[PDB]
């Protein structure tokens, strides 16, 4: 998931990975910074529980 390009050791940020995986469900038109927060905080509280 962190690696997408074979012949370049630069890596993709994980927030780009989730934002891409939202588009296969439905094509996201407008994206906001607030949507990143509520996904992440519910994710981090899920792992702690």
Partner 1 sequence: RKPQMSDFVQITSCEVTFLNTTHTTFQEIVIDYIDINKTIADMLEQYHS
Ligand X SMILES: *[C@@H]1O[C@H](CO)[C@@H](O[C@@H]2O[C@H](CO)[C@@H](O[C@@H]3O[C@H](CO[C@H]4O[C@H](CO)[C@@H](O)[C@H](O)[C@@H]4O)[C@@H](O)[C@H](O[C@H]4O[C@H](CO)[C@@H](O)[C@H](O)[C@@H]4O)[C@@H]3O)[C@H](O)[C@H]2NC(C)=O)[C@H](O)[C@H]1NC(C)=O
Which residues contribute to the site for partner 1 (CB under 8 A)? Answer: 27, 29-31
CA–CA distance, 27 with 30 (Å, rounded to integer): 9
Q: Binds 27, which of ligand X, partner 1, none (CB < 5 to 8 A, cut-off by type)?
A: partner 1
Min CB(10)–ligand X separation in Å: 30
SS3 assignment, position 33: helix
38 binds ligand X per the rule CB under 6 A = no
45 binds ligand X per the rule CB under 6 A = yes
27 phi and psi angles, rounded to 5 deg: -70, 110
């Amino acid at each position: 998931m962190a690696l997408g390009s074979i012949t370049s050791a630069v890596a993709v940020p994980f927030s780009m990975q989730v934002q891409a995986r939202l588009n296969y469900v439905a094509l996201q038109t407008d994206v906001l910074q607030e949507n990143q927060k509520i996904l992440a905080n519910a994710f981090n509280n899920a792992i702690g529980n």
